[PDB]
């Protein structure tokens, strides 16, 4: 049912946007249908976990069935703002990471009749829609300002996190626009501390904290919860969530994930990379620096192998257990003064813990 009306509001939004493009932007049918396909390919195709969470939080907190419908509808729009925001990130992300597949299908910039230059712009259009839809529905809403302040900061912090992610192969001390530099060879920068910063900003905020806050805002209950504990949980579940993505990027079959990993080729500072270098032996670390950050398959195979050889799946489990009980503890601290919020928060966790996706 949540998923039912979630798709109903999607159609509203798609109608409003595309129609306006024809009525107020002098757009021709061919281009109007192109945006439809671009929208559907990039926004539909996922499990909508960020969007659906907003509804759950809103519903779980609204405790005259109009107030219920008001909060419900708004929660769905706020739901699609993040889904569209995620749609925006992934389009640009796939481009930057030179990815091939996304959600079982080719990445947007990989579509035969979608140019890279146009893909970039579509990615921007996606971001502009979040604002366009919000302004259309929340027009006369007391929280409109607060909603967008927090929405944009999260977007901003996520872009910053992508700065950290995109520039982790480079010795930050040799980071100067006017002078080039190649992939690091010592990987001194590949530290858990540098990994944690990357993940906290590029993933955590928009994937866990944002969905929670928007649901709290439409529910007019933000001041009721302990924003501090809530923040601690969002960062914790966020990191964990990203650590999973990193392992799945290397071990989960492309068809089960719906995308072909590029971390090894892109010499990304993944969790698997910083955890390996931290425990591996002289020879292991050497064979790594010699085969990492390359497209060659025997070079790629080597890095995959070396990961297994080093048994990272065991470090993972210990990490997962650490988080699992750290999350449980925080939720109990939250459950004390806000049981309604506590429940919705645990559902988000349960959707994360040991996911295969």
Ligand X SMILES: CN(CCCCc1ccccc1)CCC(O)(P(=O)(O)O)P(=O)(O)O
**CA atoms of 355 and 348, how far apart (whole Å):** 11
Q: Which residues contact 334 (CB under 8 A, 6 or more apart)?
A: 225, 226, 229, 230, 233, 341, 342, 345
Residues tagged in the binding site annotation for Mg(2+): 93-94, 97, 165, 245, 249, 263
Closest distance to ligand X from the beta carbon of 162 (Å): 3
Binding site for a second copy (CB under 8 A): 21, 25-28, 30-31, 33-35, 37-38, 41, 92, 95-98, 111-115, 117-118, 120-122, 124-125, 128-129, 131-132, 135, 139, 144-145, 148-149, 152-153, 155-157, 159-160, 162-164, 166-167, 172-173, 175-181, 197, 201
Examine residue 121 and tell whether it contacts ligand X (CB under 6 A).
yes
Q: Which residues are documented as binding site?
A: 93-94, 97, 165, 245, 249, 263
Question: From the list a second copy, Mg ion, ligand X, none, which binds 33 (C-beta under 5 to 8 Å, kind-based)?
Answer: a second copy
Least CB distance from residue 80 to a second copy, whole Å? 16
104-119 b/e with 16+ CB inside 10 Å = b? eebbbbbeeebeeebb
Contact of residue 203 among ligand X, a second copy, Mg ion, none (CB under 5-8 Å per partner type)? ligand X
Q: Would you tell me which residues interact with Mg ion (CB under 5 A)?
A: 93, 97, 99, 165, 245, 249
159 contacts ligand X (rule: CB under 6 A): yes
**Closer to ligand X at the Cβ: 199 or 222?**
199
Based on the shown chain and the rule CB under 6 A, indicate whether residue 158 belongs to the binding site for ligand X.
yes
2 burial level (CB within 10 Å; 0-12, 13-18, 19+): middle
Using DSSP's 3-state secondary structure scheme, residue 176 falls into: strand
Is the CB of residue 334 less than 8 Å from the CB of residue 226? yes
């Amino acid at each position: 049912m949540p998923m039912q009306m979630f798709m109903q509001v999607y159609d509203e939004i798609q109608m409003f946007l595309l129609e306006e493009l024809e009525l107020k932007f002098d757009m021709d049918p061919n281009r109007v249908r192109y945006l439809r396909k671009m929208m559907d390919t990039t926004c539909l195709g996922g499990k909508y976990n960020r969007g659906l969470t907003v509804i759950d939080v809103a519903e779980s907190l609204l405790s005259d069935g109009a107030r219920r419908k008001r909060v419900l509808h708004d929660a769905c729009v706020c739901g699609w703002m993040i889904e569209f925001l995620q749609a925006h990130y992934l389009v640009e992300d796939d481009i930057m990471d030179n990815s091939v597949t996304r959600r079982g299908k080719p990445c947007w910039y990989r579509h035969p009749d979608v140019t890279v230059q146009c893909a970039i712009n579509d990615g921007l259009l996606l971001k502009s829609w979040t604002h366009m839809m919000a302004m259309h529905f929340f027009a006369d809403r007391p929280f409109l300002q607060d909603l967008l302040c927090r929405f944009n900061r999260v977007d901003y912090t996520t872009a910053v996190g992508q700065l950290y992610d995109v520039t982790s192969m480079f010795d930050s001390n040799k980071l100067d626009p006017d002078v080039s530099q190649p992939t690091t060879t010592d990987f001194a920068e590949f530290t858990l501390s540098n990994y944690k910063r990357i993940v906290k900003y590029k993933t955590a905020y928009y994937t866990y904290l944002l969905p929670l806050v928007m649901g709290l805002i439409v529910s007019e209950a933000l001041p009721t919860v302990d924003m501090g504990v809530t923040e601690e949980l969002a960062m914790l579940m966020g990191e964990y969530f990203q650590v999973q993505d990193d392992v799945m990027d290397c071990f989960t079959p492309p068809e089960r994930l719906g995308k072909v990993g590029t971390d090894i080729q892109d010499a990304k500072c993944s969790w698997l990379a910083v955890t390996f270098l931290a425990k591996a032996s002289s020879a292991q670390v050497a064979e790594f620096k010699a085969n990492y950050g390359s497209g060659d398959s025997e070079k790629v195979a080597t890095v995959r192998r070396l990961y297994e050889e080093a048994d990272l799946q065991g470090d993972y489990v210990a990490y997962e257990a650490a988080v699992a009980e750290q999350v449980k503890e925080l939720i109990e601290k939250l459950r004390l003064c806000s049981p309604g919020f506590a429940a919705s928060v645990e559902t988000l966790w349960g959707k994360t813990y040991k996911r295969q996706k």
